[PDB]
Amino acid sequence: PISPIETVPVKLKPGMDGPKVKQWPLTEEKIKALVEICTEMEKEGKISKIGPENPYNTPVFAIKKKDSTKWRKLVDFRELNKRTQDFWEVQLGIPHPAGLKKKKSVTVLDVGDAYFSVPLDEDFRKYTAFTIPSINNETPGIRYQYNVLPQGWKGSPAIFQSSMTKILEPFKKQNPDIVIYQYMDDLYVGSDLEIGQHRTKIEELRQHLLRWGLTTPMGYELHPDKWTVQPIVLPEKDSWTVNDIQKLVGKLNWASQIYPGIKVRQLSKLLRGTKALTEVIPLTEEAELELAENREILKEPVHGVYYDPSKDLIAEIQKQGQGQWTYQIYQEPFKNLKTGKYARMRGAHTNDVKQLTEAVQKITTESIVIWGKTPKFKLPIQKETWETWWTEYWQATWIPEWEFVNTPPLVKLWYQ
Amino acid sequence: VPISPIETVPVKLKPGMDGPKVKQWPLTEEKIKALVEICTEMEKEGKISKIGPENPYNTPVFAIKKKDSTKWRKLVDFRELNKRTQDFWEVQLGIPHPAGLKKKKSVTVLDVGDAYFSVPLDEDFRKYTAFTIPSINNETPGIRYQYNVLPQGWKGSPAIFQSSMTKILEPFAAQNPDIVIYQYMDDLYVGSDLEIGQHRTKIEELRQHLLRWGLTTPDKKHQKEPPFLWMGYELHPDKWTVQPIVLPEKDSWTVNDIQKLVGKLNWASQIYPGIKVRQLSKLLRGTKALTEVIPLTEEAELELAENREILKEPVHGVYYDPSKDLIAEIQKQGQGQWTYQIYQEPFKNLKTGKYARMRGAHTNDVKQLTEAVQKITTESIVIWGKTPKFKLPIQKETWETWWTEYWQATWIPEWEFVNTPPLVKLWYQLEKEPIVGAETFYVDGAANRETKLGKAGYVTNKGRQKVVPLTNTTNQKTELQAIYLALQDSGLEVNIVTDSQYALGIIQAQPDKSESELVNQIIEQLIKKEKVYLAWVPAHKGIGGNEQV
Ligand SMILES: N#C/C=C/c1cc(Br)cc(Oc2ccc(Cl)cc2OCCn2ccc(=O)[nH]c2=O)c1
């Protein structure tokens, strides 16, 4: 391999040093996998062993590709990204098309391998250093740094930008109705075509890229035109106890914060006096009128809620049980950009961590499609547990930022 | 004479920083001669070079007499240089754990002398290492030197030496794959399963190899007969344990004393099953000072007593056998306290350990068990590179009914039920639905947030009403004590209804134990009951409610 022009100069944000993040301990299996992988990548001159004079480190994990038996190496570049990519966001930045979410179908392709063709700027290489950890600190880890553009670093899709635009240009002009957006190592291709026809166009693009030297190792198929903020549902029941009306009034009270108009004032008079919880209550005229106020005002979303590109995206997930989970993506409290639910199977395979991982990946993907950025998650899981088991189910080239929330009181009831 | 033919590691100063300039003219006219001798003997070995005053840099040098007086040693203060030099890769933040080592037929321990002085230093950097022995006096210029090798105490010596040693070893490890070598600082720990004679041979080969590289090794045998007192361990050929731990006896204890105490206890807990640090550590919430005297409690005294009882009879650990299964067993101990043993064999323990929760007010047994399992998973991954088979004192019905309806996501590996009481169980379960015909208490309570006086009260459906006065209480403790009140005044089946999101928060999580006495009482009432249903209604929304101001 040879560079067409000299390596693209890559500097760091002023007053910022390279990432010193420590390497997570690994199982012997994953270590061996990373050792084969890195031996081969070193044989291919993609990476090089480094000395004690390289203080920087960013973690490495071993995750599988799709369903296969091939071990893949995933580097967490989030820190190096925060450091070098914030002004690589502005300088080389790839603008986000706003029409990708309106198209009837969207497919995703992994183009990351392409980055292995381009060499990385020498001066910057020290910052890509990683370590394969030994079991039980019996030896110091194995230390490599990237010679070429590493996957997962967001400087790589920015540097490869021009080339991707070249390769894509003919396909783009031949198909004006197709939206193509590169986020990280992924190509997101939207169309209004029928599913089969969309797959034809997609296979066309695949083979095109393939004969331009771009390898792309049914599949991942998105339908963003089914995506909308999910409304609030008040229960449908034949006979109503006092407790049911309590929950009704409560959920209505919490919901009244989002939408101002609704009022429960006529539903409280049926609970007048001190009732037994299981006492059955009829439904009067006025309360039913205020229920008519209740249901039709909750099926139409709030106004004045707009996305702010400056503010981060925050995603909260709550476990509703039986494999079901719910989520909300929003910048500021009481204002919701995106709202949804997710349902895995009834078991025979899945567990909590699996379902949560798939959920997080889904939500991140949606956010990538819509806002061109990944949300920051508040995760309903113990920190150590996630940090241990998350790589197991992780099928994606990127990683979102995350924290761990310990305290939902009532919200599981309210969002179901 | 240990010179070296080794590739040096390039070193730069922190950007925008020049070399250290610090000077000492006076005193020590006795030790200055020792410095002369030391430096002349260090020059012939090529370790240092005398330099012409071209205006280079300077750092202090002191000659300290060693104890048991025989020879003099030379000390240099590099803190300034270390402040101005670049950052390196962390040599070791960890230690290997003996429980993870593989049992070998022969283990040889070599220590390389003049380790740092046997590794050459980068040329362009050498000027920054310049130190100058003063001259007695009369305004005669002192003798200027600089280091040609890794200076002792320098910032980049351990890492660079580790690298150099690694590379020096690299060919030999390939030539003799049947033996295993570990690097720790200077020390090389070699081991093999082959014949004792073959072992002696290989060891001698390696010794002469290192000596060809300029790294000296013990000339009389390998020395170092097992034990093997290493890093606070006793390493026996077939066994491993902890160096003797002396627990003192005192009339008065300070923060330093309790800290060192809980330290030694922690260090003991790995090989000694049953160690409890909880109350003793609770005494350390007095961290305000250091030399401040802390009076012991009864629980702490009994804790230290039980620990003393545990330590009095020695017990040992066993090494690792990758061809054997890995098992982990957790047993319940005391308030917020758990203990585990990891073993491949029934009576042979790889190690032991403890777990306790220092953070959060209220938590139940299933949760704490889960957390223990997690800690052991992490620990086993770090030590052995895998996750063991867990054997737990919990029924599957229990845990299944736990992680299903627990709001938090959690995962636990393959685990087998073992019956060794106490078995972890659910002491009570709240109803998910209200109780028919059963008395429904409407509870409330409040407090003046200044006077710090409050009231806790209830109004039922059957017409019963009550208000209990409460002194020195806040708004939360009142609305908890209202639930308490409704509990103690109700039959075996009760529907309690509160406007407190706090109280509902505590109760709905279903803690079996807390450190709050009131919450402990509420727990006891919940256990004593049969069917309890907690329900919540928005505060000040004018439902049935209790209004007492
Ligand atoms: N100073 C001092 C000594 C410290 C020290 C520190 C470490 Br880390 C390891 C070590 O010895 C070993 C070295 C390599 C291997 Cl593969 C196993 C070892 O032990 C296997 C178990 N074993 C350990 C000791 C012994 O005599 N016989 C034996 O079979 C020694």
From Swiss-Prot, chain A:
Changing W153F: 10% loss of DNA-directed DNA polymerase activity. 22% loss of RNA-directed DNA polymerase activity. Changing D110A: 5- to 12-fold decrease in affinity for dTTP substrates. Strongly decreased RNA-directed and DNA-directed DNA polymerase activities. No effect on RNase H activity. Loss of pyrophosphorolysis (reverse of the polymerase reaction). Changing I245T: 96% loss of polymerase activity. 45% loss of RNase H activity. Residues 218-223 are annotated as: RT 'primer grip'. It comes from the Viruses. The record marks W389, W402 as: Essential for RT p66/p51 heterodimerization. Changing G250A: Complete loss of polymerase activity. 25% loss of RNase H activity. Disulfide bonds: none annotated. Changing L187I: 29% loss of DNA-directed DNA polymerase activity. 46% loss of RNA-directed DNA polymerase activity. Residues 44-222 form the Reverse transcriptase domain. Changing W390L: No effect on RT p66/p51 heterodimerization. Changing S156G: Complete loss of polymerase activity. No loss of RNase H activity. Changing Y393L: No effect on RT p66/p51 heterodimerization. Mg(2+) 1 binds at D110, D185, D186. Changing I167T: 34% increase of DNA-directed DNA polymerase activity. 18% increase of RNA-directed DNA polymerase activity. Changing I167V: 70% loss of DNA-directed DNA polymerase activity. 64% loss of RNA-directed DNA polymerase activity. A motif (Tryptophan repeat motif) lies at residues 386-402. Changing L187V: 22% loss of DNA-directed DNA polymerase activity. No loss of RNA-directed DNA polymerase activity. Changing L74V: No loss of polymerase activity. No loss of RNase H activity. This is p51 RT. The lineage of its organism: Viruses, Riboviria, Pararnavirae, Artverviricota, Revtraviricetes. The gene is gag-pol. The chain holds residues 600 to 1027 of 1447 of the full protein.
UniProtKB/Swiss-Prot annotation, chain B:
Changing Y442W: Virions contain primarily p51 RT. Changing Y233A: Complete loss of RNA-dependent DNA polymerase activity. Complete loss of RNA 5'-end and 3'-end cleavages. Changing D186A: Strongly decreased RNA-directed and DNA-directed DNA polymerase activities. No effect on RNase H activity. The record marks F441, Y442 as: Cleavage. Changing K66R: 10-fold decreased sensitivity to ddATP and ddCTP inhibitors. Changing M231A: No effect on RNA-dependent DNA polymerase activity. No effect on RNA 5'-end and 3'-end cleavages. Changing I168D: 16% loss of DNA-directed DNA polymerase activity. 24% loss of RNA-directed DNA polymerase activity. Heterodimer of p66 RT and p51 RT (RT p66/p51). Heterodimerization of RT is essential for DNA polymerase activity. The overall folding of the subdomains is similar in p66 RT and p51 RT but the spatial arrangements of the subdomains are dramatically different. Error-prone enzyme that lacks a proof-reading function. High mutations rate is a direct consequence of this characteristic. RT also displays frequent template switching leading to high recombination rate. Recombination mostly occurs between homologous regions of the two copackaged RNA genomes. If these two RNA molecules derive from different viral strains, reverse transcription will give rise to highly recombinated proviral DNAs. This is Reverse transcriptase/ribonuclease H.
